[PDB]
Amino acid sequence: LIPIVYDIYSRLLRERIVCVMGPIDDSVASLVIAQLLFLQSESNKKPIHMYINSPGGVVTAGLAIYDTMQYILNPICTWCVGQAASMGSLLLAAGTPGMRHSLPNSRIMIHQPSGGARGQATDIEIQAREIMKLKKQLYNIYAKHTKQSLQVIESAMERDRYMSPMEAQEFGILDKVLVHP
Amino acid sequence: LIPIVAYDIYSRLLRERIVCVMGPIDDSVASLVIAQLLFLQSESNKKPIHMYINSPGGVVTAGLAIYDTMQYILNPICTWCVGQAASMGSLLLAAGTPGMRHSLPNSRIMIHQPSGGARGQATDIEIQAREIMKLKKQLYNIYAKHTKQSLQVIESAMERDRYMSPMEAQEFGILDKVLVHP
Amino acid sequence: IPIDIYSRLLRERIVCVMGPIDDSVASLVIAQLLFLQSESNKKPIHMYINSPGGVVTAGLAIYDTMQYILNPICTWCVGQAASMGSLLLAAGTPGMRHSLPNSRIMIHQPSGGARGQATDIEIQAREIMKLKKQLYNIYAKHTKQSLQVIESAMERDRYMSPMEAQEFGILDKVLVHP
Amino acid sequence: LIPIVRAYDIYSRLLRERIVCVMGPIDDSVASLVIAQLLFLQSESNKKPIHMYINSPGGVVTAGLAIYDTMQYILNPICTWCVGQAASMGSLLLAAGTPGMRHSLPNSRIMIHQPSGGARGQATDIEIQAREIMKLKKQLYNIYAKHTKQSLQVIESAMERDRYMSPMEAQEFGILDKVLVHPP
Amino acid sequence: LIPIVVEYDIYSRLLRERIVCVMGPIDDSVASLVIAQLLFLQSESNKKPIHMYINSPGGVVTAGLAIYDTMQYILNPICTWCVGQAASMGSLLLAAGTPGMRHSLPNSRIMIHQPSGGARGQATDIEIQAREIMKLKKQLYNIYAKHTKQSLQVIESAMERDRYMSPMEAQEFGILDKVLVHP
Amino acid sequence: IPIVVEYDIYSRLLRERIVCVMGPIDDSVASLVIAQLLFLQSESNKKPIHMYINSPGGVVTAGLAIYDTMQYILNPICTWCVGQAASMGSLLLAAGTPGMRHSLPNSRIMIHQPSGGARGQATDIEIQAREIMKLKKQLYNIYAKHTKQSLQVIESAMERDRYMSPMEAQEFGILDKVLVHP
Amino acid sequence: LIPIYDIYSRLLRERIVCVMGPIDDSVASLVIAQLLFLQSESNKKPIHMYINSPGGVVTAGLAIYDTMQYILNPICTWCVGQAASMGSLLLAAGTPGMRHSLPNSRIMIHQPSGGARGQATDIEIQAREIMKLKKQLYNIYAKHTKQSLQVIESAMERDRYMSPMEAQEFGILDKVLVHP
Amino acid sequence: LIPIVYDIYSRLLRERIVCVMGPIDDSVASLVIAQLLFLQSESNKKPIHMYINSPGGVVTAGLAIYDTMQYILNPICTWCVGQAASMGSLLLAAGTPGMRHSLPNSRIMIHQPSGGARGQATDIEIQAREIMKLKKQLYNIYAKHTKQSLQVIESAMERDRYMSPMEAQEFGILDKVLVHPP
Amino acid sequence: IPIVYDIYSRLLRERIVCVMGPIDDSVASLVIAQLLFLQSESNKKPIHMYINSPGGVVTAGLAIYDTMQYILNPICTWCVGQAASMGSLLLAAGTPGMRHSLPNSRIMIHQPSGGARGQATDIEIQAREIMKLKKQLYNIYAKHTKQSLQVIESAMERDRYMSPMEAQEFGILDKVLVHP
Amino acid sequence: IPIVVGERAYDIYSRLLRERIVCVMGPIDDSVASLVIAQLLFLQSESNKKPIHMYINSPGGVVTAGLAIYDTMQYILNPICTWCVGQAASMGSLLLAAGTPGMRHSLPNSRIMIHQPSGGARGQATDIEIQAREIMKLKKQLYNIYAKHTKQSLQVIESAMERDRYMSPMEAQEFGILDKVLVHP
Amino acid sequence: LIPIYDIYSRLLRERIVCVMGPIDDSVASLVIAQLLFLQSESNKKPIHMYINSPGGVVTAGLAIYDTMQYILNPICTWCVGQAASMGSLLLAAGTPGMRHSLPNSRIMIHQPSGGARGQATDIEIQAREIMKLKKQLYNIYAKHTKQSLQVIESAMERDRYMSPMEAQEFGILDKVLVHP
Numbered sequence A: 001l002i003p004i005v006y007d008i009y010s011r012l013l014r015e016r017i018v019c020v021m022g023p024i025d026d027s028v029a030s031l032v033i034a035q036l037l038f039l040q041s042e043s044n045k046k047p048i049h050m051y052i053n054s055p056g057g058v059v060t061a062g063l064a065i066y067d068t069m070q071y072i073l074n075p076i077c078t079w080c081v082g083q084a085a086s087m088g089s090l091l092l093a094a095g096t097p098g099m100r101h102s103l104p105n106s107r108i109m110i111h112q113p114s115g116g117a118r119g120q121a122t123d124i125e126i127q128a129r130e131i132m133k134l135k136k137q138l139y140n141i142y143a144k145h146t147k148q149s150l151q152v153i154e155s156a157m158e159r160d161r162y163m164s165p166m167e168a169q170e171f172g173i174l175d176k177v178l179v180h181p
Numbered sequence B: 001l002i003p004i005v006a007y008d009i010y011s012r013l014l015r016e017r018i019v020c021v022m023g024p025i026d027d028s029v030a031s032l033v034i035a036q037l038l039f040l041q042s043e044s045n046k047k048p049i050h051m052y053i054n055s056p057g058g059v060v061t062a063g064l065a066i067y068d069t070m071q072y073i074l075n076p077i078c079t080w081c082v083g084q085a086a087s088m089g090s091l092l093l094a095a096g097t098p099g100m101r102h103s104l105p106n107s108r109i110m111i112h113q114p115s116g117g118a119r120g121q122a123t124d125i126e127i128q129a130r131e132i133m134k135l136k137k138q139l140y141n142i143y144a145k146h147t148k149q150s151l152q153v154i155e156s157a158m159e160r161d162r163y164m165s166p167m168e169a170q171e172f173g174i175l176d177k178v179l180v181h182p
Numbered sequence C: 001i002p003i004d005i006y007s008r009l010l011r012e013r014i015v016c017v018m019g020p021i022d023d024s025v026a027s028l029v030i031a032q033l034l035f036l037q038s039e040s041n042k043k044p045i046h047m048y049i050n051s052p053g054g055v056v057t058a059g060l061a062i063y064d065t066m067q068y069i070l071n072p073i074c075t076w077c078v079g080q081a082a083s084m085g086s087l088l089l090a091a092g093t094p095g096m097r098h099s100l101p102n103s104r105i106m107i108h109q110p111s112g113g114a115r116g117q118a119t120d121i122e123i124q125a126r127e128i129m130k131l132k133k134q135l136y137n138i139y140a141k142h143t144k145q146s147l148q149v150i151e152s153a154m155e156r157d158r159y160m161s162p163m164e165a166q167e168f169g170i171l172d173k174v175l176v177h178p
Numbered sequence D: 001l002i003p004i005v006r007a008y009d010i011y012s013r014l015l016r017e018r019i020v021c022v023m024g025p026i027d028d029s030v031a032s033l034v035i036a037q038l039l040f041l042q043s044e045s046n047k048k049p050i051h052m053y054i055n056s057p058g059g060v061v062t063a064g065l066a067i068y069d070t071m072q073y074i075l076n077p078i079c080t081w082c083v084g085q086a087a088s089m090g091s092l093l094l095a096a097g098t099p100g101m102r103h104s105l106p107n108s109r110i111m112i113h114q115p116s117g118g119a120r121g122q123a124t125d126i127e128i129q130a131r132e133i134m135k136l137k138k139q140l141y142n143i144y145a146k147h148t149k150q151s152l153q154v155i156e157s158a159m160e161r162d163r164y165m166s167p168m169e170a171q172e173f174g175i176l177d178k179v180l181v182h183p184p
Numbered sequence E: 001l002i003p004i005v006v007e008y009d010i011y012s013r014l015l016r017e018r019i020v021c022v023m024g025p026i027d028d029s030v031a032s033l034v035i036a037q038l039l040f041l042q043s044e045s046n047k048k049p050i051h052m053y054i055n056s057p058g059g060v061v062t063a064g065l066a067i068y069d070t071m072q073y074i075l076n077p078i079c080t081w082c083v084g085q086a087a088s089m090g091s092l093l094l095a096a097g098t099p100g101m102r103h104s105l106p107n108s109r110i111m112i113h114q115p116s117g118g119a120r121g122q123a124t125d126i127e128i129q130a131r132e133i134m135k136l137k138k139q140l141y142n143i144y145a146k147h148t149k150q151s152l153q154v155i156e157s158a159m160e161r162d163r164y165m166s167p168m169e170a171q172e173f174g175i176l177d178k179v180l181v182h183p
Numbered sequence F: 001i002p003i004v005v006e007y008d009i010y011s012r013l014l015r016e017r018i019v020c021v022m023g024p025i026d027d028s029v030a031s032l033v034i035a036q037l038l039f040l041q042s043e044s045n046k047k048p049i050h051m052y053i054n055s056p057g058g059v060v061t062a063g064l065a066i067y068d069t070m071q072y073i074l075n076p077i078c079t080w081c082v083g084q085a086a087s088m089g090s091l092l093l094a095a096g097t098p099g100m101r102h103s104l105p106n107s108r109i110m111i112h113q114p115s116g117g118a119r120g121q122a123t124d125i126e127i128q129a130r131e132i133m134k135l136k137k138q139l140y141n142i143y144a145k146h147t148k149q150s151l152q153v154i155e156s157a158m159e160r161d162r163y164m165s166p167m168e169a170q171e172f173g174i175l176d177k178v179l180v181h182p
Numbered sequence G, K: 001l002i003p004i005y006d007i008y009s010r011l012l013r014e015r016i017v018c019v020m021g022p023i024d025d026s027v028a029s030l031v032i033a034q035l036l037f038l039q040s041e042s043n044k045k046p047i048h049m050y051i052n053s054p055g056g057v058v059t060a061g062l063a064i065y066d067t068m069q070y071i072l073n074p075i076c077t078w079c080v081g082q083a084a085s086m087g088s089l090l091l092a093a094g095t096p097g098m099r100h101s102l103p104n105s106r107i108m109i110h111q112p113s114g115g116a117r118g119q120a121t122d123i124e125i126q127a128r129e130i131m132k133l134k135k136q137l138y139n140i141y142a143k144h145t146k147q148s149l150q151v152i153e154s155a156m157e158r159d160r161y162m163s164p165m166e167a168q169e170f171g172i173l174d175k176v177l178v179h180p
Numbered sequence H: 001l002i003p004i005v006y007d008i009y010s011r012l013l014r015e016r017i018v019c020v021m022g023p024i025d026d027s028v029a030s031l032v033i034a035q036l037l038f039l040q041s042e043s044n045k046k047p048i049h050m051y052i053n054s055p056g057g058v059v060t061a062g063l064a065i066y067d068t069m070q071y072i073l074n075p076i077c078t079w080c081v082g083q084a085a086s087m088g089s090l091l092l093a094a095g096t097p098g099m100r101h102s103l104p105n106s107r108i109m110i111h112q113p114s115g116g117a118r119g120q121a122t123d124i125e126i127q128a129r130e131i132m133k134l135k136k137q138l139y140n141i142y143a144k145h146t147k148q149s150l151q152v153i154e155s156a157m158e159r160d161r162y163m164s165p166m167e168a169q170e171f172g173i174l175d176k177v178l179v180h181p182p
Numbered sequence I: 001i002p003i004v005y006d007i008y009s010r011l012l013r014e015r016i017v018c019v020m021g022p023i024d025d026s027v028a029s030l031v032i033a034q035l036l037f038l039q040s041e042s043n044k045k046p047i048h049m050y051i052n053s054p055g056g057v058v059t060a061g062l063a064i065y066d067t068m069q070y071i072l073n074p075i076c077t078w079c080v081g082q083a084a085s086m087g088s089l090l091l092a093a094g095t096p097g098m099r100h101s102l103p104n105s106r107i108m109i110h111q112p113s114g115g116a117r118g119q120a121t122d123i124e125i126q127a128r129e130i131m132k133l134k135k136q137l138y139n140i141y142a143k144h145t146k147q148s149l150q151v152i153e154s155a156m157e158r159d160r161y162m163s164p165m166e167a168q169e170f171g172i173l174d175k176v177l178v179h180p
Numbered sequence J: 001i002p003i004v005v006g007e008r009a010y011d012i013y014s015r016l017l018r019e020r021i022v023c024v025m026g027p028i029d030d031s032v033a034s035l036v037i038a039q040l041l042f043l044q045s046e047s048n049k050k051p052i053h054m055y056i057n058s059p060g061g062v063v064t065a066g067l068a069i070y071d072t073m074q075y076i077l078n079p080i081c082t083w084c085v086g087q088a089a090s091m092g093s094l095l096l097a098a099g100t101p102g103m104r105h106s107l108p109n110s111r112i113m114i115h116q117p118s119g120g121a122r123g124q125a126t127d128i129e130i131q132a133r134e135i136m137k138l139k140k141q142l143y144n145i146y147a148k149h150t151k152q153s154l155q156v157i158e159s160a161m162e163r164d165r166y167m168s169p170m171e172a173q174e175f176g177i178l179d180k181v182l183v184h185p
């Protein structure tokens, strides 16, 4: 359940490896950000490996991890394992250019954000105003790292868009579809 | 528990051309009220119909359904507020025939903007958000039509929960007479 | 439901206000009182009260109907007439408000709830005080008491015996035998 | 909870006036009653028109199609009256009325949208159920295009998302014929 | 709420017209009511035809066989009318109608599939319950092949998974006779 | 539940001297069947009684209660199996008048030993277990009486769940005729 | 579970206080305990406070606010992800010139929400204190944001979301970081 | 409770043993992949032993463990203990050719993946295409390591296919069926 | 729970594996991990297995049985309290002559139980697999008790409770020890 | 649970186990019986001659769990001193009487209860008969064990354990369950 | 809610046993285990017992009482907050002249409560036992408070709350503290 060799996630963290597993929420985001700032505080040069196997989660939690990645001076090497869907695909695409990897049988999914709203009509319009702001804010972030136009981003993320590692490499999400070290 | 006079107490009133809108208003309550308003119209298209309101409100689409049926039928409608007429219950009180909108002394009228919910993708949130804004402006135009107020007064008053006494509701234009028969 | 005993009493112009009082109970009571007024606006109406209380707006709805109809209303407290049940007992026609010897009457300020933003809570707190002032003026009107004593008595739960409620002005006669 | 007006409830009284009420969510229970009422009204007369009052937020697609088939099958002219709202399959029943007899109230609301559903099981069972919900999608689109007199391209474009319409917009689109303010 | 006529609920009013409604899922409660109606209609007249309206997603297999047996037993010609959908045992009752008297509305759909069930207990009880379910599967396949005029090899390959059909496809398969638009 | 007028569909069949044993069999169902059988005997002790069976079984004491009343009344009883007659349902099917036990072609009959529970002290377990073995032997003698089988064949066939086709139940002695047509 | 001390304690050794998730009496007690521990180390060394909170109890937020102002150390507030409700107050409560935010973060300000139950006298008592908290928060916001009381009233009447630049113009934060 | 020697699973990890026990989800997949990288960092030449006793689980979690196995340079010795079903059988076949073992009374099961889909018809078609892609993706992986044609994999995995260790060896899933170490 | 470092780990030093409580994939994985660890420490030293299990998952018990037969170490099985269902199979799987039981213990054997749900095709596959497990368990009991299959089939058709003396006569254990 | 204190931390029950003290408190199930049996075997491995102290404060529990502890108590060569604290009911009374003769003690206000075992049975009639014979064997098995250690005849045991039989420490000594009734020094 | 060596283990090092919260078999077994450990350390050093219990199981309170009276160490009972039901019995069970209580503490005594269900034979047995427990508690209270059995019967017939001075006069205490 938690092997000791020092839990198994710290021994990799000692090798400068940050694991992003399971759904992404404020708990997972705060742990990843705390590890990114600590590894930067130890060195501003050594690269940071980030293993991603997340089906998605909260949008604010994904942007919190994204900003911390795009703020630390260290180059981040993203490694997609199993799957990187929803905000997990953004963290995979937000890696250092040329250092974004994925395994052969992985799968990447992108889609527009979903949310909720309840209250008076004035409160619904305010909350719907921010959901559409996050939608276009995510579209600008994806178009920045994938080198795609906003038209292609809006057309592809209107629905759930699953991609194979080769389909994500050509789209601009990752860079290398590894088959061996 | 509904008493028997054979009918129930509400049907004995329905024979006297009396429709009771008591309690929360949803699809079930609106469907029953509309069915009664059309059955009373079939008996006579001239005899006035009396509507008693003791409703805290409910679904906006259900309240608009009753309002449309009230304005659709050519029968005169006398509205009677008992206890309280809040949310859509206040709209049904003001939707009566001009000059036939009454209220008891210790009644209470509350008006407020509609509330709702929305969940789904960002595209679905926007579609449902405007639709609530369309219902909000649709209610504000109906209130301004029967209360003879401007849209600025309706918007400023119904931004929050606006409770009114029968005198304040008469001064605002919702009801016409504050009855007192001691 | 014995064959309907409440429907039989209504034939003799008797409206029973038993159990708690909510929007459903008030709707039935108001519908019966107006039905009895449509038959005759002169014949007296008997109201049997055995209620532990309930929603305030439901009690005010019954009260306004009681004062609107021209029929004399004889109130008969049986067992207990607490909270809004005490108001309906005192709202009867003066000289026609009765209570059984071992019954009891309770009066107290209205209670409620409020939740939301600081603006909505202020609006709801405004209205719960208007109901408190409105109830005190109605109790002071029918019990022939001043607003000072009504505020001092209804600040907490105030239970009264049929003799204490008669002296306080809630009811008129404490029946021993007919 | 229904008033009693020999005695019957208010819905059974309207049924004697040849009025069927489709009010509330439409499932198999509601559809069967509506189909049973439509069959009984036809067995009383094949010429007298049938009035259908609609106040439904929608429901099961197979339930709405069941009512639609019975509406087109029976020989009686069907006057559809939208009261309150006619959303999802309720809008299809409104547009399924006799041409020229589809009415609505001025503040009513009409919504059309593509069908939804679910699928669970093996990959083979997923593909079978998925192809079925796509056949129902194309089946609804051809029915809407038939009664709204629109092209398939317009129907496919408008029903991709939830499409809310006003009585004036639903009249322009071809769902209803006239928006009534008073009895004609 | 079921509406009331005054010639009496709407299903009781149709029962006097010799119309039995098989609506919703089919279980022992629904099957027993349909059987009680069919045997009452035969006692009233063994010559007058019985009409059966079907709008069922299916249900218990034993309940569907109970209705099918009563259908084939009574001497009355049975006109089956599919409204909405006739799936699982509902498609079997639709095919169980008198030949030439099996109809369906245009936008209906018919689904057929092999039966499903459960089994739990000791290994001896599992083998008893499994053999009985397999006997029901072969029993249904023979009934379908009898009324659809198809071969067992066709029935075995079609009902292996869920097989949805349009009224035109169901007519060609042999489940119903006529697809009706206007009478 | 349908209604006739001249009355539910089961009450209308009872006027034709038909008793329906549908669904599970518990103390409630057994009491109704026995109340109808004794009522049908009070009308006529010589006219036959028809019993339609579509039951998966239930409580054994409830099945024995119906069996006792069936054998006690003087009326001949024609048992008709529709759908399935399992557990005590097969016992009521075999308890019909000899030569008047029928079944539809696709019906299914099952027989099995009784099941139950027992909880308490060791003394209570022994008493409750002894009564279950008495019910088991009491059922086996009743089955062997009406099927004309030996106790051994009844004991070995009912050790596990024994499902039979209508032809297999006719050969075993549970029913007499497998009707493909009236 | 949490990666090994632990990880938050490591950042505390670097004088970093993390205000993550909702804010209640338990979270406020931990933050105040960490702030008092960092002040016991030194009375002038800067304390860093990273915020990623959707809000929470108002009384718990005021507990953190008073502790932030009372301690002598300069507080460096960093908005990560979001800082809504009381989270924006703690973000704006930082030392002037030391209130930062990430580029894609978001700030929300709104009047306090609560509840009241009981009799009319108890409803009126609890309704007063909520109004007092509303003016108390409005005075706290107007102080650090250097805005007028009318602006704070019109802004926090409904929910108001702001980008890091919009909150910098309003007066919540001071510096908006960007691509290094 | 896990014993203490560290825990019993950590002492085996010192002997280069990775345990894939119980159902497979994202939590189990991450721990296995993390343990496989610990053994690779210690040595790229030393073989890794992976004991499997899993009924299966999430397919994406099984593909994650599969990719790490094929990625690392270390030879992997898969040992089927108890059962290797669903993705557990794929991990058993994913071992290095010639190093896939099984105990005599183990049980191997292969079957096509299962999933769910809900939403609008457009969302159903998108998710249905993905389930069919996972189906053919697993079929090509099984065909690659079992050295079978795609025709055989489709027929064998259309339903739940249970295999004895001797049958799974002939099918190509494992290599050796051991009783005692030879 | 008790420390001496649990009490079971202290026994694991003395090459003692405890199989107590219901057996599932969790218990089976722990037992196999202990058996593999004790084999790595020594291939000749015997392994003692104390059994107090009411049974459980059949595949979990088969995983323990195969691991017992795989390792080269002799395995002494000690029945304490009860050894029922798969617990009796592990008791009989010990090294011939090293299968013991306390005097007031209790041994029970029975055919496996399971479930099946789905289409008629799926029922037949799962039913065929349950019957394979039944014959597989029957061959294992006749493998260690040296009884004929006719005796194994007739005894395990129902729940067969045995005393330690009866289980020794049947061949499940070898010694009934009152004192060492 | 508190802890005490070459520098190991000991929970309060391990500190007593180091003094060769096994605590049997609360209900007795497979989990409790497994821990007690594990502790008795550990204390025997340290020394097969030093006495083992067993404190009992149990309301009872599973019969097979109590027999598992009883057999292990009789198997190990170490003399076992049983100390009844609070109450020793159901199987707890059997463990109190299972101690070495002359070393069975009890506190003044303790309470000892004995009764026949209870159980359940569900399934077919054949399964009910099998499970009924098995609880009957356990009943006779417990009666023979009580009659052995209390030195009472089997008939006295059958008459006393038909219902719940509560005893004071003085009554349990006269009956033969314990030897010494401690008297507050 | 455990401040770290935890705070209760640190007090046990000073020979202080805490009896907090309700008293059940779990609490009684811990208190008895601590009293036995503190006796093995020293038979002469006094043992301090801090009591803040609302009461609980009677057999659990009798177990602690029998352990307080069996060890040779003088027991100093210190009532804090409340000592109700069996907590008051353990308070009066201290060494004569070493029973203390804080000024605003509260002592409550009451007859035992219990349940009963089953046949009429089982009802009489369980009721005859709860009366023996009732009379047993009455003898223990009358022994340490030096009151008569008739006074204990009348006092514990209902819930009898006492102030620290009323408990001292009744015989439950010895000294009502104000300062050490």
Ligand SMILES: [Cl-]
Binding pocket: A069, A070, A071, A072, A073, A074, A075, A076
């Ligand atoms: Cl970077």
Ligand SMILES: [Cl-]
Binding pocket: B070, B071, B072, B073, B074, B075, B076, B077, B097
């Ligand atoms: Cl009008």
Ligand SMILES: [Cl-]
Binding pocket: C066, C067, C068, C069, C070, C071, C072, C073
């Ligand atoms: Cl009056």
Ligand SMILES: [Cl-]
Binding pocket: D071, D072, D073, D074, D075, D076, D077, D078
């Ligand atoms: Cl038509």
Ligand SMILES: [Cl-]
Binding pocket: E071, E072, E073, E074, E075, E076, E077, E078, E098
């Ligand atoms: Cl026929």
Ligand SMILES: [Cl-]
Binding pocket: F070, F071, F072, F073, F074, F075, F076, F077
């Ligand atoms: Cl007879």
Ligand SMILES: [Cl-]
Binding pocket: G068, G069, G070, G071, G072, G073, G074, G075, G095
């Ligand atoms: Cl500061």
Ligand SMILES: [Cl-]
Binding pocket: H069, H070, H071, H072, H073, H074, H075, H076, H096
């Ligand atoms: Cl490899």
Ligand SMILES: [Cl-]
Binding pocket: I068, I069, I070, I071, I072, I073, I074, I075
């Ligand atoms: Cl071996």
Ligand SMILES: [Cl-]
Binding pocket: J073, J074, J075, J076, J077, J078, J079, J080, J100
């Ligand atoms: Cl010994």
Ligand SMILES: [Cl-]
Binding pocket: K068, K069, K070, K071, K072, K073, K074, K075
């Ligand atoms: Cl002492």
